[PDB]
């Protein structure tokens, strides 16, 4: 009979309770105080312009129909009490497919303080939509948003607020850093009003500033493109009479260049414009194509067909003696100006 006291209290709080009406329907505006604990910022899929985030989406409001007098003050109740009372219908404005986890019980709690204050935290994984501007790829920085607000209640009925200060109302856990490519720098929040055909709603926008780490693309796209240009520019160190040898340099370097041109944008979306990685590849294509037409220039001016044995042999060319210095120099000038104008932005 010790638990019959808490049985009488909980049944009295639901006797005459109508869960289709927000509290203070005819009196005031229901302030729902919210804060987010990010357990793990999941992987960012740049191919689908989305990102995954696991949150502890806490909410708190005040209901005057749930006052009680009893032994304890805060009732750490079960989960199924939350479906029997009014809960705010917060939805994410830019969510795509978000899942409330159900194992083993539903991952929600509900605490009812004795003055009528409520706390209602949910564990949710949000596949929100992050609009990107992949123009400075891969050295870009993004501010992926997460906008949430009420759906059926306008700004004269339900207004949102942060529980703690807005600087410390979205907290990222230290161990949850499931970004493998990007690098989370910090979070910023905001509040505003959106306009719709039905009315005016209170939106709650938070931004997660992300910066991409270019350590993958150096050893996948940049270094094999740089080593291809060096592979094309060793062709000026051969002799003029080795046509079959130098045309292997002139063909296989640009043929492995155009495969890297294909295989660089494979992960990238159908980007309408050209990224900064495509500008490096296009200049590197010009450096391996000019090496071939330099060989086409010197082969046209090669008079004899035999080679030095020590007869009058072919004398080395001024084109090869000038391309041995200028071609590593102008690629050095371009490499100095491309990285300086992009890494210090």
């Amino acid at each position: 009979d010790n638990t019959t006291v808490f049985t009488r209290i909980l049944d009295r709080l639901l006797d005459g309770y109508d869960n289709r009406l927000r509290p203070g329907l005819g009196e005031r505006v229901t302030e729902v105080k919210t804060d987010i604990f990010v357990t793990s910022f999941g992987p960012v899929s740049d191919h689908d312009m989305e990102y995954t985030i696991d949150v502890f989406f806490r909410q708190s409001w005040k209901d005057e129909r749930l006052k009680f007098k009893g032994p304890m003050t805060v009732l750490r109740l079960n989960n199924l009490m939350a479906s029997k009372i009014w809960t705010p219908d917060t939805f994410f404005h830019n969510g795509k497919k978000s899942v409330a986890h159900n194992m083993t019980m539903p991952n929600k709690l509900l605490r009812i303080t004795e003055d009528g204050t409520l706390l209602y935290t949910m564990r949710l994984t949000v596949r929100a939509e992050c609009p990107m501007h992949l123009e400075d790829f891969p050295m870009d920085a993004h501010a992926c948003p997460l906008k949430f607000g009420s759906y059926a209640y306008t700004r004269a009925e339900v207004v949102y607020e942060w529980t703690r200060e807005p600087a410390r109302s979205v907290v990222v856990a230290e161990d949850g850093s499931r970004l493998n490519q990007y690098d989370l720098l910090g979070q910023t929040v905001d509040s505003g009003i959106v306009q719709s055909s039905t009315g005016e709603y209170v939106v709650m926008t938070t931004h997660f500033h992300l910066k991409r780490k270019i350590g993958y693309f150096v050893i996948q796209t940049y270094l094999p493109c740089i080593m291809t240009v060096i592979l094309s520019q060793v062709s000026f160190w051969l002799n003029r009479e080795s046509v079959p040898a130098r045309t292997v340099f002139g063909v296989t370097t640009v043929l492995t260049m155009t495969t890297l041109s294909i295989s660089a944008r494979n992960s990238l979306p159908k980007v309408a414009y050209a990224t900064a990685m495509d500008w490096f590849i296009a200049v590197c294509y010009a450096f391996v194509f000019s090496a071939l037409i330099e060989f086409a220039t010197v082969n046209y001016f090669t008079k004899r067909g035999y080679a030095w044995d020590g007869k009058t042999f072919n004398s080395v060319s001024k084109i090869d003696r000038l391309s041995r210095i200028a071609f590593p120099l102008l690629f050095g000038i371009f490499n100095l100006v491309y990285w300086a104008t992009y890494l210090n932005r």
Partner: antibody
Amino acid sequence: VQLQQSGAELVKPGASVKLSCTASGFNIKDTYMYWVKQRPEQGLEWIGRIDPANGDTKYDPKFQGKATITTDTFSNTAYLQLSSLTSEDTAVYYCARKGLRWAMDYWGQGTSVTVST
Amino acid sequence: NIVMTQSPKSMSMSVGERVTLSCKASEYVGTYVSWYQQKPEQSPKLLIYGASNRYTGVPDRFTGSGSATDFTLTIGSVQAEDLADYHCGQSYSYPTFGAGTKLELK
């Protein structure tokens, strides 16, 4: 609605002072309590805040170890405590509460402290 | 820590024209910027809570503009009951205030 503070006081340097801010028309347990320093011919200076639901307190880094707040729910009044006050701290103290967008909408009438002979 | 700079310190204009206050934050504050006036030997009150969101009871001539860093307070027509200095606060972090901006009438 109405925010009330006690009257002005005359204190010696090195002593301790007690100042109160009585709230009426609304309870303290749902809104923060903001207290702020207003020097003469100068701007405002926030010194600390109070969460009365759990007794949480955070101070200004300059005024750490300088002020202390206790809050009684039954009395509907929160209390100052200035332990090591000097003669330089001659100003007026204002009471405030958290508003709609973390503003300070309702303010007290202000109590001016005077540390002189 | 956040610091708010109000410019200028003081100004002198007459009744019924335009004034543009200025308030610039050290780092990003989103919208939580509060404007308070201080009538001499009275209590402060609230003009705009948030950025560009008028309080109840103040006239419609007071308006604000908000951004990431800079915030302006604009009065369309200065009246004879506006004898106060305006303080620009912030609330995105632990709250801080500017030095205020005095004004006078001829």
